[PDB]
């Protein structure tokens, strides 16, 4: 909610308390999942044409006791924007792939999980330099695109090191470039997006599966957003990029998400989503196994734009087996019951 | 301080910097205790009758250096409220027992410590579902009550596990129900409150004292709040619920706190409190020993509703002995010097 | 940006997103250095004369992934202020030495690093009680001064312990007193400042170099601030107070910083700084070596008071040798590219 607007700078301070509770046969995915977010979108007029902006967002768990209380920055970036030319923003942001793949990330809790956080240029991530251009230089009303770069983010110990290095390997990444082209018109929306990132010495030489020189992503996506209806699906194919449990990555992964939502006038918005992450010849005695697969059906009710509540039912179609145990991939169902104030 | 109020949504963003310093013979309870809090109470009108709300509050220590900086969520919950029916809010909140026992938690720093944080349904805690009803459905102007449930909050390792599980044992809890009934009229206030919680496998089978199937609490409380005067005391009896050092819990504990405060017009508010936590036949070669006992006298001065400063003198009546050493219970005095801005 | 001003209390909620990236031959000092700050300055009128205030400031790194996210309180203090008498504020604040030495801390990223954080009374630090007096009781328009005390801040383990104790040794400190006297007139500014702190048992008896009973600081400083020009330099001599790598402290250190900045009307503000930290007979087979030495030249461009961007070039004049390796002192160059929104 915009709490400052004066002399051309304006500041919107925003957040939510999500009273969330998971139900499951799985004890590790069962209990209070209450959390809270807090951020600000900032903005300043420099000229007619040029406008500068900042943006921050933190997440703080509220399911944890007075000792440990895990919490983290989600996005943090600053940048400029010139009329009919483009915009450029450096910091922790969304990777360019998300531009397309996010169109299926519309469920209230689950969904949009064929990618992880800090998973190369696939979703959230540190040190994205991002050019974007809306309406193609003000000529084609609808055609937006982006050209993104991500600096190497290696380890803390000597070999393959950066100042911000992380000792976790899945969070690591190398130098990558990615692109996106989206077009919207009368609700309908085509979307292509291609990334390609270098990999760290640690990533290949921890002895994990699905190793190579480069992690690469291809992404097609279609959506329809009109007349109370949101239909959208997407194809994302990856080489050595999709995470596979703790075992490593998938040499090749064929990922597909599809969602159908209708908004009733009184407040209810039921959904019926479906996900899939088929991992092709992974090697090391597994071969063509499914990394993820579930149907997801529930409904959000909207009291208004400040209060909401929802049920979300993950129907996990994965069978229990060695691949789904060695990797440690939850094969059980989960049901989330959310009740959320925001501002 | 309410920084947003518009079209029925309103947001109050609040906090304080407490410049605090402990003096003591105990080196562990001596030094800078400076800390800071920040939260928001949120609120939105949905209808004439229905109003929805959120609330958050963090605490961040300011006595610590640039490396470690410990800090945590205190309360984080969302919920609805319907006129003359009640209110329901899920998240980290106060346990229902606090409804009564908080009437003695009126001292500036010490006091209100016959309960801990995440100590079952006794004070702060994760995953409270809480029904409340003010003025008994708008019929009896004075009679308020509550019906509270708390989900199991076990460990992180396999046996007795939840998604939010903590490896600390005192912070753990099981499924519990609790109630409260308070009545106020012309200042005077009766208050009863009863909780009863299941216990974790770890809690019984870490070999600590005062173990059982259930932790249970009984609480009576009386207060008088008028004519510059605040008199209030309370009785809280517990089975296997009160913490006793690091040794475990007290099979039975008889807890009593009493406070007397007077507010002078210029700003000074002296107090004279007294606490007691008599632990009855605890077992394991201790028997009837005192878990806590101190007289507490100081005074808060109020410059105004934004600035305040105070002295707080803990006169610890506990003697030094095996029970008060094995358990590791501070037998020494403490004096706090607070100087506090807030907003 | 002041988001609350009402009935004499006013609250300014402020922060920035600094899109920062280090370039260097050093891998440890190379990568995304994106971070964010958030604080509030608070203030309340009590009387004509008396005014009470609070202040907080947190820093949260945005170069790190969803698991670890390091962040800390920078300053947190409350205090009162009476017209023509003085002001007194207890909490994590700046040490009194900074009063003078901060006049060289005017560069956009580097500079002001002959002192560390929690480095006795030299810069940031916990538990400063600070008296200050502006314009010498309203008599001499220009002469400001301060009298500061810092409580012992030892370790967490038994010997030399405080409630806030830190297991790091360089962050530790003992009881210290410090002073400052500054005088400004027509831009020109003389400044003297002297501190003297007790040391912890751990500090001497971890076997590190430059050990003694007391860490002491002497500080002279001169500045000129007018006609788009900022010229300022400073001398800081220390006994057993300046940190020297991981090896310990410098028995004696002769520190000097000098800066020259010009503000062009359109927005550019180039600078040309120079630093030096000559460590005299340190002992343990090193003798007179340089602890730090670099020339620093770049330029900040100011779009306006909300957006800015800059380049900052550390030209490290230190040679690579045993002292600069055993201590582990970066001998390499660094170049910072900042782009910063704030509010």
Author numbering:
A (entry chain F), B (entry chain D), C (entry chain E): 1 to 343
Q: Which lines from the publication concern this structure?
A:
Porins, which are beta-barrel proteins that traverse the bacterial outer membrane, facilitate the uptake of small polar nutrients and are the main entry pathway for many antibiotics. The crystal structures of OmpF and OmpC show that they are both built of 16 amphipathic β-strands arranged into a barrel with a central pore. L3 folds into the channel and narrows the pore at about the half way point, forming a “constriction zone” or “eyelet” that governs the effective pore size. At the eyelet, there is a strong transverse electric field due to the presence of conserved basic amino acid residues on the barrel wall facing acidic residues on L3.
We were unable to obtain higher quality data for OmpC33; this variant seems more prone to aggregation and gave poor quality crystals. We are confident that the main chain is, however, unaffected. In all the other OmpC proteins, R124 makes a salt bridge with E66 (from the neighboring subunit L2); the shorter His residue must disturb the all three inter-subunit salt bridges in the trimer. Thermal dissociation experiments shows that the OmpC33 trimer decomposes into monomers at significantly lower temperatures than the other isolates in two different detergent systems. Continuous channel insertions producing quantized jumps in conductance measured at +50 mV show that for OmpC33 significantly more insertions fall into the lower two (“monomeric” and “dimeric”) conductance steps than for any of the other three mutants. The mutations R124H and D18E perturb the constriction zone, which is manifested in the increased conformational variability of the positive charges (R37, R74 and R124H) in OmpC33 when compared to OmpC20. Instead it occupies the space between R37 and R74, created by the disruptive substitutions R124H and D18E.
